Nucleic acid binder design. Sequence first.
DNA 1: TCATGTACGGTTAATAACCGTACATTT
DNA 2: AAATGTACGGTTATTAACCGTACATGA
Lengths: 159, 159, 82, 69, 69, 82
Amino acid sequence: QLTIEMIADAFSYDITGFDCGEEALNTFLKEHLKRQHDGQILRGYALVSGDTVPRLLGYYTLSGSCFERGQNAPSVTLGRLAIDKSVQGQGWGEMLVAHVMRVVWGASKAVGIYGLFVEALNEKAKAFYLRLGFIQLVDENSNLLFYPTKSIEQLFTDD
Amino acid sequence: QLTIEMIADAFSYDITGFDCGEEALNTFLKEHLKRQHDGQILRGYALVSGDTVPRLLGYYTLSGSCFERGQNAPSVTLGRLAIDKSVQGQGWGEMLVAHVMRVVWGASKAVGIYGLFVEALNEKAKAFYLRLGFIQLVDENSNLLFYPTKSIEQLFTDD
Amino acid sequence: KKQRIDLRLTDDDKSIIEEAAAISNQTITQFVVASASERAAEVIEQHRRMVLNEQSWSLVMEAITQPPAPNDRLKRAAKRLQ
Amino acid sequence: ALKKQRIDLRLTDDDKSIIEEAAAISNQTITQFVVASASERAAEVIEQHRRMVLNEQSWSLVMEAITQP
Amino acid sequence: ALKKQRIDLRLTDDDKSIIEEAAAISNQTITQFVVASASERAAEVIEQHRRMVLNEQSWSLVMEAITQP
Amino acid sequence: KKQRIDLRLTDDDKSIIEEAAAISNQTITQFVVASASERAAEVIEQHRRMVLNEQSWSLVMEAITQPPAPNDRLKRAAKRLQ
DNA sequence: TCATGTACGGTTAATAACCGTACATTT
DNA sequence: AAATGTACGGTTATTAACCGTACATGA
């Protein structure tokens, strides 16, 4: 009975034994998300279990962003996104991405937002987002992928 | 019985009623030289009388400088120069300029110094220094005049 | 001013911070807070500002003006969300 | 090479929040982010101060040279 | 507008000498040189802080927009 | 730190300095001394450094390598000095 | 064991901001 | 009389820099 909720003030989650495969995303959980190093620039959402103490098996961070020509236009950027090994290969990684766009879509209804940016550190992450329809940018921006808000509109309208 | 001496720590000169025709050089005497606003960057010399309390009837300020191509070479710059009306039109102004070259001459024997710069605010100042042999510079440096050390060398060895 | 930051550091780092603060006519706390917060603003500004070249900018403009329809895998992920 | 020295800073809520999240973005502990930011700013100030001191002493040579009673 | 307020600074001999002599070069009293330098530096800090505050509040709308329980 | 500077200023100048010092996380004295001494160093270095263009630089070089003989009036001024 | 990051609170010596005071110009 | 630039010294409320303390993790 997994659910997606926002990491609130408390952070009262059981993160003991969390492991996504990449230690950088693990240490970011124990040393930043667990200390509420967020709320003003980074906003975290969490994939949590239905246990009596909810366990965290995934998370992502979102931040308001803007892209410029060098005009200026606002956007949203998905920073980190991690899925615990226990629940990998089950589609939760793409469901979190679907929940990201849902928040972008919800945010776009109140403020102007033209799309969703993501930075692909390695080439597996690049293949992961390219598979979901993200458009990869070129040269200096070759490790950024973009998905427009109007495509997000089609995805939840139709569903 | 006028004498040229250096403005030392004390400054115990009678400067009451001093006036040089330009209030800017007057106020600089009452509001800077008399407060010992010098010793690290500006060095002042004084034309003083032989009274029981020596009266100040002239002064000049000197500062170490350097000129660059835009290499770098050191020089000396004559800043302000004032002669009280009481003793104007008698040659004390050029004798101070000759005294300026003498300390530059003495300074050049201990450290490398290639010449003497002076800034002529107006063109009367330009005519005053051009008459003594100063070479006027051009364009951005059109209110700068220069006299080389080797010409100063000639002046004092010959006499 | 109700928050706090506690730090452990080497004698070397503490010494050069103490002497640079003295040179700057600043307390240790002023020098450290100013150095960290000014550097924080640099990290944050690089994190939100996507400076796009003209080809990348054109790809974004193409995605905005001519938005693609979501593929089968992406729609399938949104149905499990719902 | 132990971290045997200490420093505590008392600051506003906004100063600590921008430092906390910038360290989170950089994926560094608060200690690394703050101590590294301060030391490297410290080394820059001392190097600049060292050049200015020797430059000013060079200017003081010309000052003493034109210093004649 | 009268100069009815006051400020006193305790400073090194080197800071006071470079301020005194720079005011002498500029042919300004110590009061003009010091208060003018501080007040236009103050206006620059006030202007930059006002742009930073309004920029930061602009970013906070996007933050609140993506803040959904 | 045995010297001092005393200031009279308007309420307007005093108020904006107090608020810029607060924004900068600095005392009034730190903000004023830093603003005045930084501007002092700018004034002093502009006063001693002569940036010469290529024509003016050549005139100086010509005066150095081929120094003129002092004219009669300058020679006359050094006579009264001695 | 020990080094370390994060965290809270008390003690004390140092001083920033202020205020009174003074004097000589300038208006 | 009033405004102002420069100048000196005492008072007081604030706090920076230590230091002790605590806990949990990883070497």
